[PDB]
Symmetry: C2
Subunit: 565 residues, 2 copies
């Protein structure tokens, strides 16, 4: 039978999406700080890797109190990364190479150094109600003691309420004292979010990653007898009143009203896309919430449509070095079971807030984990360095940028996952001409670097390239999936599609060898051909699997190419 | 192609297992108490239902403090239920009808009225260490102020330690004060469990349901500097020191040593089966525990073999009327994902310790839930009443006899704890006490809805829960259900499918709208389903009758509506 024809998917439905951490990608100007001209000089890497889309962690004007998540001007670039001109050059050169470029910002809050906040604190007309401003809770017992409006706890610990001496009122900060929560019931705030997005789309951005969406909306005092209602207490003895966990965020997180804002953002993008043509512009949402609240980002049963997808953090929250093959299967099945019909699945192993993939799992698992990301249906999300198996870097107390004491600092710091990218075995691993990098270069850069992996016959990077290339096959863009564990140690993932080749992942996620009966794997006729193997596998690409009995070493993964069903 | 032959499975791998609660099944003698002559009189019901095996809740000599789970003599029958002769007649008649009979074995504890306990408390030679006896915790603050050995909390509320004046020591009770925990590090106790099991297997029992196994073994004071270690505090402020939930049972539940006892029981039973021949005798284990601790009952990575299966309580613990179709799928997949290869799956929708299936779910979901039970691979477990969709009976504070409610509850809270509503007499018919008894004075009150919900009515009427139950047990004879693959996914938040398929054999498809709203689905999305297909079973409220042809790929299901479709072989 001739292979069936498939309808082309819109780019966002099956893109390889790469998270750039711009501070650590490429320093062009010898200051030891990654920058936009650096990213521009290495756009060819994305084409070479088979990446379709890049997003950058925030690069907007920022006092850098929360390392760029505290945005003071939503319409300009942070000077350390370059200029608006550099950003426009990045869009031009990326688009010339066929890449999509997404911007990351946080709708929930602005820097207290934003003009929005300066003007709002000063009660300037049109800005007075831009943020959540509240009087103290009346204290007729001790009128000399000022009470905050409610017991709400910041994500950073302490009160979510900060006193303004100038305004003689409290403002809400769900995050840092310097990150002020916008009032999303203010039409002027909703308009300003449309204005920010329109500005960047007009420059040519292909879409946005929007952070902290669960925190957008808090209880309306109108619904609680004119006061901000206390969050219910967790009743968990390990948390005091100043500690995150003391409260259940009933009135401060996952309010149904936040989804109406998201659906409004999707309506705005759909209208923008209709009125401009070219490549669909998208929003990918970030929110840590239960499965029900996560899936409401896609849309609802009443037919509302939201984010092109909410990010899937299940591999970060629910898989670990302790996970066995049955855990891998059951967690993979959660998104695929709960996602609404027609939703696009996405998969994430890493970001700048977590241990790097081989450090969080094991060094021998890098290839199998990259295969899972690339072979599951939908969108593969790669964190900078995963394509070469970068490990966490050693960072000393004295070299720490993410500052609590010299003995315990390593339990808190996210710096080890943010060390400069290993291009090669040149000075500072080719990240910089300078030895004075903003974080130290990991000690293993001479063993683990991109240039070496391109030179050597087998490598993480070559496996990454073979997998992004495989995603062009109809079986991966349009094929069904079947996933089950064969043992506590080994699971299979089968992509199949009538008249098209079958692709099978077999992955021993354990620390011991395992033998499995390939007769148990659906749609796998033998002999089959090894398409990809883990760098430590005895089997090379092109190796024939002929026996139904297969021994997999600890961490060993194979992708088999088998005849069509 | 001619249908392929399948190798017949051992009876226990795909049986329909029915839990009898003897006290509430059939009263033969007008005392308002179910009895063995009552069960004997309705053994034909199990044949009529398509039940392969019955397990009875305990029928051994008992003060009835925990309605039989407090056993004073493990070798004889509770007088209210009848005699050893009645039991022997029950086995004979059940076996003549081709039924298997399992007994409820309660190894964790004995009644404080057992000879074991009386002799142990008296320190008679060979019985001194039969139970967990402990000195008071030394009190260096105020010497001789009597402290319990540890903070351990009973499942029925209060301290797990009871002072004996006679012995001047505390004894352990994980359950009621009257249920005394055996010492499973004592070889004589382990020997006694083999003695009990051999006695009843020799009578001809087809096996045992094993009670409360997570609680068998607690921390050895030899590993904790000669004391019983405190369980970690939960740190949940809603629980004071006398309330269940105040502690995390780290030292009192799921100890790795308990599984070695289970594997020893299986070894004994395998040897018994080998030496005696006839039908395989089985053990099914009861334990509420996390997935890892539950799966260790089957066996371990080192090749130990335990229970033929541990009961799957997921439809009790993890699904309810709050659940959507995606929850149903994701929970059904948990057992099938985590069960060891070669394991037999089982499905439990109710028991005497939990609210009835239609009460936890909804009245309009009864058929869909029985279909899930019967159509999923492996063993279907039915609790007394599920085959006719019995609802929880009303039981006042005044009528409540459950020790757990009497101990943890008061006239306002008792409903949070009481198991009595799931223990109300079985609805045979519309006669006095729904035909459970000739007496109006029943040990628990008969549910108010017996005129509407009773077996006789469901056997007469054209469409009923019971007729649906019979059609589903019959369907389990098909190779597709005994040997077929499964595929399960949600079509929406409201509707899911379960497909049983087997090349050259008919394809069977459940479609179930678990929601309170109508749902329209595309049957083109269902694997191995070619139309037209035939309705084999429908919910009693479905517009479709058995024999209806499904021809359109757009299917609207009403709230709670379930269909089984019969479709051509793949
Ligand atoms: Ca907010
Ligand atoms: Ca015990
Ligand atoms: Mg630079
Ligand atoms: Mg009686
Ligand atoms: Mg299939």
């Amino acid at each position: 039978p001739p292979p069936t024809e498939v309808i082309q998917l819109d780019w966002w439905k099956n893109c390889v999406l790469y998270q750039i951490y711009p501070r650590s990608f490429k320093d062009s100007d010898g200051d030891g700080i990654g920058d936009l001209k650096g990213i521009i000089s290495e756009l060819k890497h994305f084409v070479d890797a088979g990446v379709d889309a890049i997003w950058m962690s925030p690069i907007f004007e920022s006092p850098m109190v929360d390392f760029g998540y505290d945005i003071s001007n939503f319409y300009d670039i942070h000077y350390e990364y370059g200029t608006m001109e550099d950003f426009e050059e990045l869009l031009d050169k990326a688009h010339e190479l066929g890449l999509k470029v997404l911007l990351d910002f946080v709708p929930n809050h602005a820097s207290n150094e934003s003009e929005y906040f300066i003007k709002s604190e000063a009660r300037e007309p049109g800005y007075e109600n831009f943020f959540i401003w509240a009087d103290p809770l009346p204290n007729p017992e001790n009128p000399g003691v000022r009470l905050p409006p409610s017991n709400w706890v910041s994500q950073f610990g302490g009160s979510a309420w900060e006193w303004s001496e100038k305004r003689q009122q409290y403002y809400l900060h769900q995050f840092a004292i310097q990150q002020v929560d916008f009032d999303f019931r203010n039409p002027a705030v909703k308009q300003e979010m449309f204005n920010i997005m329109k500005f960047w789309l007009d420059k040519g951005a292909d879409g946005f990653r929007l952070d902290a969406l669960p925190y957008l909306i808090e209880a309306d005092p109108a619904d609680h007898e004119g006061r901000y209602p206390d969050d219910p207490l967790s009743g968990l003895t390990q948390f005091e009143s100043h500690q995150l966990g003391y409260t259940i965020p009933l009135y401060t997180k996952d309010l149904i009203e936040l989804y109406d804002v998201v659906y409004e953002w999707r309506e705005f993008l759909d209208e923008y896309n209709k009125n401009h043509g070219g490549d669909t512009r998208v929003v990918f949402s970030e929110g840590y919430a239960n499965v029900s609240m996560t899936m409401l980002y896609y849309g609802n049963e009443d037919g509302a449509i939201g984010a092109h997808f909410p990010f899937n953090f299940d591999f970060i929250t629910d898989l670990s070095s302790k996970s066995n093959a049955r855990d891998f299967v059951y967690i993979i099945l959660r998104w695929l079971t709960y996602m609404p019909y027609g939703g696009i699945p996405n998969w994430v192993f890493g970001n700048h807030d977590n241990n790097r993939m081989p450090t969080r799992f094991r060094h021998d698992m890098v290839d199998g984990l990259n295969i899972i990301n690339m072979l599951l249906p939908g969108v593969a999300v790669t964190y900078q360095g995963e394509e070469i198996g970068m490990r966490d870097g050693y960072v000393s107390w004295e070299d720490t940028v993410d500052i609590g004491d010299p003995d315990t600092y390593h339990l808190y710091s996210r710096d080890p996952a943010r060390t400069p990218y290993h291009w090669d075995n040149s000075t500072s691993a080719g990240f910089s001409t300078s030895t004075n990098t903003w974080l130290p270069v990991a000690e293993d850069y001479q063993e683990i670097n991109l240039a070496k992996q391109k030179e050597t016959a087998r490598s993480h990077f070559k496996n990454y390239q073979a997998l992004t290339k495989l995603r062009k096959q109809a079986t991966l863009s349009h094929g069904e999936y079947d996933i089950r564990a064969l043992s506590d140690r080994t699971f299979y993932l089968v992509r199949s599609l009538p008249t098209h080749d079958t692709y099978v992942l077999l992955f021993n996620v354990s620390e011991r060898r395992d033998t499995v009966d390939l007769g148990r794997v659906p749609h796998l006729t033998l002999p089959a051909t090894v398409y990809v193997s883990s760098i430590h596998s005895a089997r090379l690409a092109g190796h024939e699997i002929t026996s139904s009995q297969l021994s997999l070493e600890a961490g060993e993964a194979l992708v088999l190419k088998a005849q069509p069903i």
